[PDB]
């Protein structure tokens, strides 16, 4: 019932294979219907099929001829059907198959050799079936198989007598999760021709049983091992012992309630490159806990440590030098924890660390000092995240060790202080500083004089004060390109605040009180603080209380692409106020008191616009006031979202719900 070289007939209550469709289709989705059998005759005309998805039906068995009728079929999906008896003929003629999907069919056992014919098959999925064993054949077959999926079955042993039918196969993925294994009988993994990835997640295993598995994995091509939610209560120098004789490069131990990590627990993994330890209950990370992991370049310790119970030093504890062995560690994540604080050698020895995320990693980092991040002095850290740590004061030279740091996020903290500008000393290559969402930030003229390379500076909702200095606090930032000064109730801006920032591209000033500075009656004249901003592309002035616009505030912004002044009190605008906005592609006056979209004002702006939004306005349905706008609406190609429902006329009394586009 839907087609574009792909016949989508999904969810149509179909009890019959459509004979309507064109005979040149190559994909046929028949999922979620009441089909109970696929007689090969009804597939004779659809011979060009390469994908046949017929999941979610009442199909009981397949006649052999079905395959003969589709000799190009490469993807067959019979998942979530009643297909529970497999014979030697069910797939015998489906030879060009590369994916066979047989999930959720109450398949309790497999008899002889259903798959011996599928020599091209790459992926076999038999998950969510009552399979009590991995026996799929009585001979070596499926040498081209790469993905064997048997998760979510009743399989409780791995025996070489059943997996050696893969002795010519190189399995990239052997998914055995959510199975209740209790024994890894000897040789079982060397049975497979090559075993690259093994997945045992939600497999209730335990520390001693896990030890055996690794011994069985010894001398295998294993590269990916995933023991997530394995109930690994603890580890020991003995656990991953067999992994000594592997080149394993990925290990997942997340969601294990991992309580104690013995020393050298992971000493046997010198080729490991990716370590996923998140979501555990580690009590104490001793010195030698991570000894040996000298090739790991990505560690993840998110929520890895225990949570503060009632505080009687129920906090975690990370001894110094605990990371000194990870020499290649490029990317460390420790976010969402209760580490009490940064000790003087916490991060010592991480000579390749580039990205470190410490978001909410701590109980509280109350004060950053010139001692705090000293252990990082010898790493090339480029990105440092310190959000959600209740940081309250930053002192001089606090980041002096982070020489090559480029991005620094201090947002979502409780920082209340005066930025003397000493703080940023040392930051020689800094490009972004996020200070949004803090308690109080009081500016000086040198608040950023030590960081001229700065390109992004975010000051959202910090009750900013002293932005109105004689040379603005931002004057030394001559390559600033994004400045966010929103939600600061800024009532006084000086004329020359953005002077010098010739490169400024995005300026967010929404939710301030700088409304009177553009009234004609301002003591001294309106403040033209946007002058000289050639490269400005985005300007957001929402919720500022504006109700006048001076005729030439936007006179220099020729590259302005998005202008955003809604949720103001604007009713009438000076004619030719938008004249110089030639690249303007998005104009927004969404909630204002506008009644009169006159051509003399909006003409040049509307000229070429990608999108316009001036909804919810008290439009006056009179020719002098709305007429030319209505014509432009019916004519223009610029799209006007919610046009017929949220552009409503309010005057005169006789036109009140009339959507403005109808007269």
């Amino acid at each position, epitope marked *: 019932t839907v087609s574009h070289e792909v016949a989508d007939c999904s969810h149509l209550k179909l009890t019959q294979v459509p004979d309507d469709l064109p005979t040149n289709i190559t994909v046929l989705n028949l999922t979620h219907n009441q089909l109970r059998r696929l007689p090969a005759a009804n597939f004779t005309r659809y011979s060009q099929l390469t994908s046949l998805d017929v999941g979610f039906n009442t199909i009981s068995k397949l006649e052999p001829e079905l395959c003969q009728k589709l000799p190009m079929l490469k993807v067959l999906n019979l998942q979530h059907n009643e297909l529970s008896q497999l*014979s*030697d*003929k069910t797939f*015998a003629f489906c030879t060009n198959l590369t994916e066979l999907h047989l999930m959720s069919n109450s398949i309790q056992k497999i*008899k*002889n*050799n259903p798959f*011996v*014919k599928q020599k091209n098959l790459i992926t076999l999925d038999l998950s969510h079936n009552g399979l009590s064993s991995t026996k799929l054949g*009585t*001979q*070596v*077959q499926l040498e081209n198989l790469q993905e064997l999926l048997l998760s979510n079955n009743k399989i409780q042993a791995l025996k*070489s*007598e059943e997996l*050696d*039918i893969f*002795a010519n196969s190189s399995l990239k993925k052997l998914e055995l999760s959510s199975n209740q294994i209790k024994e890894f009988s000897p*040789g079982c993994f*060397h*049975a497979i021709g090559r075993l690259f990835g093994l997945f045992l997640n939600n497999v209730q295993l335990g520390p001693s049983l896990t030890e055996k598995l690794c011994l069985e994995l010894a001398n295998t091509s294993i590269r990916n091992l995933s023991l997530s939610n394995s109930q690994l209560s603890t580890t020991s120098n003995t656990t991953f012992l067999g992994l000594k004789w592997t080149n394993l490069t990925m290990l997942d131990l997340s969601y294990n309630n991992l309580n104690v990590v013995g020393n050298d627990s992971f000493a046997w993994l010198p080729q490991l490159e990716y370590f996923f330890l998140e979501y555990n209950n580690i009590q104490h990370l001793f010195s030698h806990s991570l000894h040996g992991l000298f090739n790991v370049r990505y560690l993840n310790l998110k929520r890895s440590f225990t949570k503060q119970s009632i505080s009687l030093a129920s906090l975690p504890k990370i001894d110094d030098f605990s990371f000194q062995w990870l020499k290649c560690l490029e990317h460390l994540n420790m976010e969402d924890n209760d580490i009490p604080g940064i000790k003087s050698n916490m991060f010592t020895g991480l000579i390749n660390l580039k990205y470190l995320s410490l978001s909410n990693s701590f109980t509280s980092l109350r004060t950053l000092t010139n001692e705090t991040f000293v252990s990082l002095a010898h790493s090339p850290l480029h990105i440092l995240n310190l959000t959600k740590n209740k940081i309250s004061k930053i002192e001089s030279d606090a980041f002096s060790w982070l020489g090559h740091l480029e991005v620094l996020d201090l947002g979502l903290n409780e920082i209340g202080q005066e930025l003397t500008g000493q703080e940023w000393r040392g930051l020689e290559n800094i490009f972004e500083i996020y200070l949004s969402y803090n308690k109080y930030l009081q500016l000086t003229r040198n608040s950023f004089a030590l960081v001229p390379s700065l390109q992004r500076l975010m000051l959202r909702r910090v009750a900013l004060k002293n932005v109105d200095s004689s040379p603005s606090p931002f004057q030394p930032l001559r390559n600033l390109t994004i400045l966010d000064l929103s939600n600061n109730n800024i009532a006084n801006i000086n004329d020359d605040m953005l002077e010098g920032l010739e490169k400024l591209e995005i300026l967010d000033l929404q939710h301030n009180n700088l409304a009177r500075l553009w009234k004609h009656a301002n003591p001294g004249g309106p403040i033209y603080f946007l002058k000289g901003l050639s490269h400005l592309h985005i300007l957001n002035l929402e919720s500022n209380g504006f109700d006048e616009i001076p005729v030439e505030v936007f006179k220099d912004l020729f590259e302005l692409k998005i202008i955003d002044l809604g949720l103001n009190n604007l009713n009438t605008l000076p004619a030719s106020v938008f004249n110089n906005q030639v690249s303007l592609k998005s104009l927004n006056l969404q909630k204002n008191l506008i009644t009169s979209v006159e051509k003399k004002v909006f003409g040049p702006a509307f000229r070429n616009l990608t999108e316009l939004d001036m909804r919810f306005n008290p439009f006056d349905c009179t020719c002098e006031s709305i007429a030319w706008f209505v014509n432009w609406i019916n004519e223009t190609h610029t799209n006007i979202p919610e046009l017929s429902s949220h552009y409503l006329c309010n005057t005169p009394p006789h036109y009140h719900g009339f959507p403005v586009r109808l007269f």
Partner: antibody, heavy 122, light 107 residues
């Protein structure tokens, strides 16, 4: 071409052990694409199955129930031949014995042995 | 399980067509083989995987497998074709299952 050649005592006394030998030529016993076994035929036409051996990572041998306690088939790579043995034979075991090459996928028997009559009589 | 069952005897006038049937609960779900055994001789595979012959078996021999019956068909019967015929398949414990055999007679 491949061909199977039996050899062994055709007179065996009761309670004793029947022992035969299939000698292959034109094919390896350790080869893939096939398994090796035995088929017995009592003179009253009954053509019945005994057991087979086959190799995947190791050698496995699946015998028929009814001889599952007496039969022993196993290969001999050094000579390229496999063997049949039955212990405590009764006169019921008097029959014609064929060695056989079952071939994969579905265990069809392309090539048979010449047959060797073995009689269990005192 | 699976129990192959074929007729005791069948005769054929030489030159005519012989068919020997092999019934069984869902035999169509299996691949069937056919063995020809002449008096005092090891059998010979004539049809395997139930449909096409091996190398050197003549084209006169042919088989099918549908529903609950599988048939070996021998067009243009010659005098030599007089033999016993067995159908076979394999189920997991027993790697060869045999029918009763059919004794084919020719004038």
């Amino acid at each position: 071409q491949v061909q199977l050649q039996q050899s062994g005592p055709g007179l065996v006394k009761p309670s004793q052990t029947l022992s035969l030998t299939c000698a292959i030529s034109g094919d390896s016993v350790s080869s893939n694409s096939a398994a090796w076994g035995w088929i017995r035929q009592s003179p009253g036409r009954g053509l019945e199955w005994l057991g087979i051996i086959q190799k995947r990572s190791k050698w496995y041998n699946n015998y028929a129930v009814k001889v599952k306690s007496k039969i022993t088939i196993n290969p001999d790579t050094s000579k390229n031949q496999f063997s049949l043995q039955l212990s405590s034979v009764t006169p019921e075991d008097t029959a014609v014995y064929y060695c056989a090459r079952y071939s994969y996928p579905f265990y069809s028997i392309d090539y048979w042995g010449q047959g060797t009559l073995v009689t269990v009589s005192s | 399980d699976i129990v192959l069952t074929q007729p005791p005897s069948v005769s054929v006038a030489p030159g005519q067509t012989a068919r020997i049937s092999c019934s069984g609960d869902n035999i169509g779900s299996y691949y069937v083989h056919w063995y020809q055994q002449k008096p005092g001789q090891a059998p010979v595979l004539v049809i395997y995987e139930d449909s096409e012959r091996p190398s050197g078996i003549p084209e006169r021999f042919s088989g099918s497998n549908s529903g609950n019956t599988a048939t070996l068909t021998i067009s243009g019967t010659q005098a030599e074709d007089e033999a016993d015929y067995y159908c076979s398949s394999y189920d997991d414990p027993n790697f060869q299952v045999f029918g009763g055999g059919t004794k084919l007679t020719v004038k």
